[PDB]
Design brief:
Shape of chain A: globular
Largest sheet of chain A: 5 strands, mixed
Radius of gyration of chain A: 22 Å
Bound molecules: protoporphyrin IX containing FE, the ligand O=C(Cc1cccnc1)N[C@H](CS[C@H](Cc1ccccc1)C(=O)NCc1cccnc1)Cc1ccccc1
Strand order of the largest sheet of chain A: 1-2-8-5-3
Structural class of chain A: alpha+beta
Number of domains of chain A: 1
Number of helices of chain A: 17
Distance between the termini of chain A: 65 Å
Number of strands of chain A: 10
Helix content of chain A: 40-55%
Oligomer: homodimer
Order of helices and strands of chain A: HHEEHEHHEHHHHHHHHHHEEEEHHEE
Chain lengths: 462, 462
């Protein structure tokens, strides 16, 4: 409890921590419910303890901008230390300081709009595959589980845009390349293991010396050798792998081979469950708000008549589609929180922050803050209309973070999801079932996902 | 053994490491014998593994200067991570990066020649106490153990120059203030505990969370409350404590109370066994080289006739005394090694050094290098004569390190020891006994100290 007297000294409010545990027992109702209550009880800033680790929450847009943008390179550069990681220490999302600054520079040209526009035909091909699999489920009137049909789609886009492997994962759910990649599910930080890591972070170096890794050693080994097969088959005889292979064909020393494999794994880990989960949250709102679904289908047919195939330019042309995606990401920011480690004693916006404190931004609680959003629990896409989009603070609505360490795959993720929604809504309408959980209840765990899997009815428009 | 392929990749020679242990089994004959053999077998640079920690040894004066001086603030700023330390993390010798740079700036005015000249009368007073205790042992013809009579003297100077406590520790060897401070003996890094820390450094955070500290918790607790008693007795109603108390009466935030206590402990830990051990090494050489002892006694009587009390200016006037002290420190550089942690990938003097490597300078092996010293094992004080002192490279002879992180108490240590030798040689002559180990054999452990305690005969000149 020697690390529990810091917030009381600084005059910062917060829940009283227990010895060893800190405030982790308050996670019984999830990260989201704990952050909303703390914002309600304590005001604009407060503190708590993940075990012995002090966490300072901030909700001021100016102070958020200083952390994420202004003093990013100088003070708030890294996230909370994470382990055990093994060779995945070289992943950009885990790297720190100049290593991260180097990796971010080596991978930024990979995520330009020019490279993204060249990936659209590959992503659009599996929009068609998604339709033929949805139509087989629609011609047989059976509730469809969205996470399975979208999870199959997200897996398809990943395998093709990152390695050129072309699989119908829904009809080959057991191909060895699909088996390993489907094990890359995002971490439940409230599960028994990660809560124990919070109480015994001194055990992280012990797990590392035993080569134990939060990424399953069999999946990383499979992709490590699979990449080294592809690397020596293209060399010599458009995806993310080739962009990184061309990058290491050189300031910063070219991407290493092991460094390159770590980024490929991170791109799969980042885009698999996220793209599948968001697309399920979107179709839930469209099915429970049919007027929104019709207005979107009308816009899609206006830009793409006769079910015209979507393109890069016609996707950005659609504004109500962007309004629906943004509004869904408001109600369900799957990151929930943003974090930065304060690397040195600083004073920002008139507040002292000691070295070692984890500065946290509660994105979920701010996305539902009535002091910034009217009727925050309601699905209202008109908040993001070209008229009202000016009245939204970019440091309150942060579904992809902000600053130099925001989501590097933001453009890709938005284009990937919008291409799916266009092709799906051009051919189908989605209606609730009896077994559809209405209203949707969120999981009380550490992942932003529905309590029950979203099941809906799918009807063909032809 | 994943950290044992680094030196073979870089093309750097060195002994082949065993799994888990690295090269620690080669410490069976001590740090000194291992460094001399490695310098002999492998040449100017080599590498080895303290467990999994790579250690790169360098012996080039230009490359040594780049590490200790040139790229000190930018690359080689900290020493090897050390634990478990508890609150002694705030000690200057343990602090890192800007914390060390701040502490070094707060404590540098404490070690100026002006402050040292004001401490001479306090140090000289216990030169007289040292004589009355040596004379009681000399009037009774019994071999004197130097580490006990000098250890009592060194303890006397410490208690007075750091807190103003005035004790005859040889006749009060059981005063509570002497009991705790005599437990501050320097660490034997080849003892069972510190070798286990080398093999299981992942256990250091475990020892920290249990409040286990390499500094005995009872000694630190005794001095913590003892200092807070003295701090609130002088406040309000010349030593190291007062200099630091006046310093916190303020750029860098003033020394904290706990920070202040950590420095006081570090000054005791630094000056206790060191001053006692060096003074024993010096008197061993004087007793086995009587011509040197007579020449020194003649110089002392020439500057201070009629056993005149030594002063700050008359100590610096003595050149043969400085030659004897420097020559003894050459044969016995009690630090043995100098170390710096390479904090970022750099290329110095045409050699690449990866981040995380411990760069080591083998001071003991260089002090006895025949390629810089003629007859290196012989005690020849004339190497440091004002004629030959120009031919000695300050990066080969480094008894106090070099650069911004050299020994901050160098001036104090030299003045403290010289004041003792002047008062002792003005009144006594030291001759070998039958039980005097000649030639002196060094301890095969991790501390530079004689195998057997140095015992000598002491005769009065009056
Ligand atoms: C709906 C989908 C996604 C959402 C909502 C999302 C959101 C986020 C958020 C909130 C962060 C943290 C930002 C911060 O800490 O300030 C992040 C980081 C990151 N995201 Fe995503 N992401 C998505 C998909 C993707 C995809 C498809 C990729 C593909 C490469 C990706 C790659 C990354 C990387 C590499 C980082 C770490 C960046 C760094 O540390 O420099 N994400 N994302
Ligand atoms: C014969 C006596 C002594 C010898 C041979 C000696 C030698 C050394 C050496 C070799 C270093 C390391 C330098 C480096 O890493 O480059 C050091 C560091 C240090 N010494 Fe001593 N020392 C002696 C006595 C003292 C005394 C009396 C003090 C009293 C304050 C002291 C305080 C320190 C401190 C604080 C450091 C660490 C400096 C830093 O990290 O910034 N030493 N000493
Ligand atoms: O960088 C990302 C990757 C990502 C994932 C999905 C979509 N895009 C990007 N994720 C960030 C935080 S990185 C790290 C998690 C991690 C570990 C290993 C490899 C990759 C990432 C973390 O949580 N560190 C701090 C921490 C917190 C709590 C407990 N321990 C440590 C946040 C995020 C999460 C989900 C979706 C989006 C963003
Ligand atoms: O700073 C000093 C202090 C000192 C002592 C005596 C005289 N003056 C100064 N000592 C340096 C190295 S500091 C640290 C040891 C330490 C630990 C706690 C508190 C103080 C010091 C270390 O060894 N770190 C690296 C390391 C190496 C091996 C294994 N683990 C870690 C060296 C030295 C030693 C003896 C005499 C002089 C100098």
């Amino acid at each position: 409890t020697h690390s529990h007297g810091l917030f009381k000294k600084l005059g910062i409010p917060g829940p009283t921590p227990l010895p060893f545990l800190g405030n982790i027992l308050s996670y019984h109702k999830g990260f989201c419910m704990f952050d909303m209550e703390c914002h309600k009880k304590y005001g604009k800033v407060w503190g708590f303890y993940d075990g012995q680790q002090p966490v300072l929450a901030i909700t001021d847009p100016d102070m958020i901008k200083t952390v994420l943008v202004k003093e990013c390179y100088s003070v708030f550069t890294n996230r909370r230390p994470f382990g055990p990681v093994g060779f995945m220490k070289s992943a950009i999302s885990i790297a720190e300081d100049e290593e991260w600054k180097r990796l971010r520079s080596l991978l930024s040209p990979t995520f330009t709009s020019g490279k993204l526009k060249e990936m659209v035909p590959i992503i659009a091909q599996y929009g068609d595959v998604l339709v033929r699999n949805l139509r087989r489920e629609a011609e047989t009137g059976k509730p469809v589980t969205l996470k399975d049909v979208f999870g199959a789609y997200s897996m398809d886009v990943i395998t093709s845009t990152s390695f050129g492997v072309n699989i119908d994962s829904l009809n080959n759910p057991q191909d060895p390349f699909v088996e390993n990649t489907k094990k890359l599910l995002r971490f439940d930080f409230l599960d028994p293991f990660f809560l124990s890591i919070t109480v015994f972070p001194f055990l992280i170096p012990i797990l590392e010396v035993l080569n134990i890794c939060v990424f399953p050693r069999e999946v990383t080994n499979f992709l490590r050798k699979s990449v080294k097969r592809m690397k020596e088959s293209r060399l010599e005889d458009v995806d993310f792998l080739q962009l990184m292979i061309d990058s290491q064909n050189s300031s910063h020393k070219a991407l290493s081979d092991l460094e390159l494999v770590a980024q490929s794994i991170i791109f799969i880990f980042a885009g698999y469950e996220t793209t599948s989960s968001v697309l399920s949250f979107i179709m839930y709102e469209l099915a429970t708000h049919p007027d929104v679904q019709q207005k979107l289908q009308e816009e899609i047919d206006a830009v793409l008549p006769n079910k015209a195939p979507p393109t890069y330019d016609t996707v950005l042309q659609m504004e109500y589609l962007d309004m629906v995606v943004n509004e869904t990401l408001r109600l369900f920011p799957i990151a929930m929180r943003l974090e930065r480690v304060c690397k040195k004693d600083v004073e920002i916006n008139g507040m002292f922050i000691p070295k070692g404190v984890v500065v946290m931004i509660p994105s979920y609680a701010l996305h539902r803050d009535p002091k910034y959003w009217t009727e925050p629990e309601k699905f209202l896409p008109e908040r993001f209309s070209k008229k009202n989009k000016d009245n939204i603070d970019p440091y309150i609505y942060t579904p992809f973070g902000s600053g130099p360490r925001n989501c590097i795959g933001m453009r890709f993720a938005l284009m990937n999801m919008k291409l799916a929604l266009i092709r799906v809504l051009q051919n189908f309408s989605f209606k609730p079932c009896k077994e559809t959980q209405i209203p949707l209840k969120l999981s009380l765990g550490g992942l932003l996902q529905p309590e029950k899997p979203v099941v809906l009815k799918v009807e063909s428009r032809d």
